[PDB]
Amino acid sequence: VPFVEDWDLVQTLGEGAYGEVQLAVNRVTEEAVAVKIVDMKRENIKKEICINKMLNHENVVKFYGHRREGNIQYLFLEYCSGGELFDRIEPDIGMPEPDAQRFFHQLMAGVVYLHGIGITHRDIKPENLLLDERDNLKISDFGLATVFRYNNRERLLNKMCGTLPYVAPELLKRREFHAEPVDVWSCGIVLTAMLAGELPWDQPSDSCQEYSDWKEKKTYLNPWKKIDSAPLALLHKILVENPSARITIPDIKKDRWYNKPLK
Ligand SMILES: NC(=O)Nc1sc(-c2ccccc2)cc1C(=O)N[C@H]1CCCNC1
Structure with a gap:
């Protein structure tokens, strides 16, 4: 008071x-x-x-x-x-590709940091990413965050908490799963929204036609058709259904678009 x-x-x-x-x-x-x-x-x-x-x-x-x-x-x-x-x-447009690239680099730095200390956020989305007065990205809202690594010993997670259009498909298919690929997947959904102004599906399930369309590489449909080939090739490696085949953050940092000078 x-x-x-x-x-x-x-x-x-x-x-x-x-x-x-x-x-x-x-x-x-x-x-x-x-x-x-x-x-x-x-x-x-x-x-x-x-x-x-x-x-x-x-x-x-x-x-x-x-x-x-x-x-x-x-x-x-x-x-x-x-x-x-x-x-x-x-909405339906996104933002300029250089702005999206800069935000994504900063998202990656914040996520590398959390995972380095064995924390997963579990609710990564544009509403939980804030900007300071210099437009630096800040990860926010740790109410669903949890520890996935204790010293150097990982545990598998099993909670399907998280905002559904951002959720990785293993959360609907596997009873337990690795933490880090779930965070990598939501980051991919954030990148997609940044580049196209549009979420690709309600949920990454078989029954969702828009998810089936992506699995079938129909990148001539929205939102994918608004996205340049270079960033799209990164999204092809992130929005990979099998989390064991999904790109890791050290490999994201080697991606051509990730390292592409723009503007
Ligand atoms: N630490 C902060 O400054 N938090 C801020 S600043 C802000 C803000 C600042 C300037 C203009 C408009 C909003 C919104 C939020 C905030 O936390 N909003 C939540 C709400 C629930 C979803 N996650 C985000």
């Missing part, structure tokens, strides 16, 4: 499942901080805090701290004044 004495909760920045994100500005210094408010009596809030404590990287939203007031949790986060990546994507 003494916080709201000195800090103005200026307005709502977004709505999550358990509550809102508010912009807080200090009436004296004018410093701005984002306040995620979560109702424990309604994403896993205990783990979110716990995972946020581990993170220190230029492409992850910085966590300052938290507190509990009754049943309500408050997370204090760096304010990313550039907003969601989602709002840089023009």
